Amino acid sequence: SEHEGFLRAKMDLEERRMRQINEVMREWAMADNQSKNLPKADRQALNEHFQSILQTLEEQVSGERQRLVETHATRVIALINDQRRAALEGFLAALQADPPQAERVLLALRRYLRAEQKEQRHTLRHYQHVAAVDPEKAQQMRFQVHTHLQVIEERVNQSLGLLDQNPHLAQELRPQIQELLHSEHLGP
Amino acid sequence: GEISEHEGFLRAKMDLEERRMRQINEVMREWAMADNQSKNLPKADRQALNEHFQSILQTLEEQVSGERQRLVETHATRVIALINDQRRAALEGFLAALQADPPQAERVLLALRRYLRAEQKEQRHTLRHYQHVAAVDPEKAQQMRFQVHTHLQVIEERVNQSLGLLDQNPHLAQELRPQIQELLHSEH
């Protein structure tokens, strides 16, 4: 599970780094106790030695976290994309069967819409997370999120357009689909 | 309660996320729905329509971050106070066991164990907070760097002073010295 591995990956890093930080803080404390009677100019330079070590360490933690986050986001989006495409191909296949079967078509469409529901939720959840901790960044992606939602809606519309090519089948399934579109917030 | 504080903070964050998401979801929906309606409209009307929704979202994003910041700062303040109280409660118990007539070795050890545990927790939280700020905001971490160092030294002193209160009773200190070192080894 991508969620499992990512969670414990952040955990291992939090643990590794908390030890390293403690060890540096430890060594910093020792050097102060050792140089407690040194002149002020001597003591300034010593602190600056350990501040320098911690800045590098802070930067490494920061870059480490950015990489962990971006890799995870890339994979989640990759999985969502693949679920959608796989579901589209399956749906297309149910449509193209001889003859088309309402059950198979319905189940296949159900998978496709569910993949798009997932894509919508993720798009909105992430936008909402960014707004919570970075309003300036949220303002910047605001229109791209909006655009993303339009792309999804247009996918759902185009898929419903394919089912409509078989008018009887579209009629036979319509009530169940309207129920599905309301529940997943995907229709028009 | 420490655990209650944790769980209550998660339900408080979760509930804020849900409420806000629903709000955002509706506005984004309305924003997508408004676009289909406005495709025929003049460019001035089209842009005004977008500016309407982007405006509503801007205040939302600001509210969201405002809520998140307030919630986080409150939780931070409480956790700190909780740790201070736990330390002070443990210190009193430790002194009570030492100042009792006469001291009982097993009680002094338990009281001590509770105090070091409190300081372990204090130290641990001090470190964790610092690390988290480093991962998300290197500039703030550089700022708080010296204070964390100072804080850890203060904790190091307290552990020594308490160990020094025990050593003031030489037989007691000898009776417990093998057990005391085990405690210190596992923690600090």
Domain B1-188: give its CATH superfamily: Amyloid precursor protein, E2 domain (1.20.120.770)
How many CB pairs lie under 8 A apart between chains A and B? 97
The string over A3-21, giving b where at least 16 C-beta atoms fall within 10 Å of a residue's C-beta and e elsewhere, is: eeebeeebeebbeebbeeb
Q: How many angstroms is the resolution?
A: 2.6
Tell me the C-alpha to C-alpha distance, in Å, between residue A104 and each of A82, A90, A97, A98, A117: 20, 9, 9, 12, 20
Contact A135 B61 (CB under 8 A): yes
- The C-alpha of A150 sits at a distance from chain B's nearest C-alpha, in angstroms, of 6
The Cβ-side half-sphere exposure at A149, using a 13 Å CA radius, reads: 29
Cβ-contact B122, B83 below 8 angstroms: yes
Rounded-to-integer distance, Cα A24 and Cα A54, Å: 8
Method of determination is X-ray
Domain boundaries defined on chain B: 1-188
Residue B67, number of CB atoms within 10 A of its CB: 17
The string over B92-116, giving b where at least 16 C-beta atoms fall within 10 Å of a residue's C-beta and e elsewhere, is: ebbeebbeeeeeeeeebbebbbbbb
Please give the backbone phi and psi of residue A60, each rounded to the nearest 5 degrees, phi first: -65, -45
Rounded-to-integer distance, Cα A142 and Cα B8, Å: 31
Rounded-to-integer distance, Cα A74 and Cα B106, Å: 56
Contact A18 B127 (CB under 8 A): yes
Say which residue the tokens 């309301």 belong to: A182
Give the contacts of A84 (CB within 8 A, at least 6 positions apart).
A112, A115, A116, A119, A155
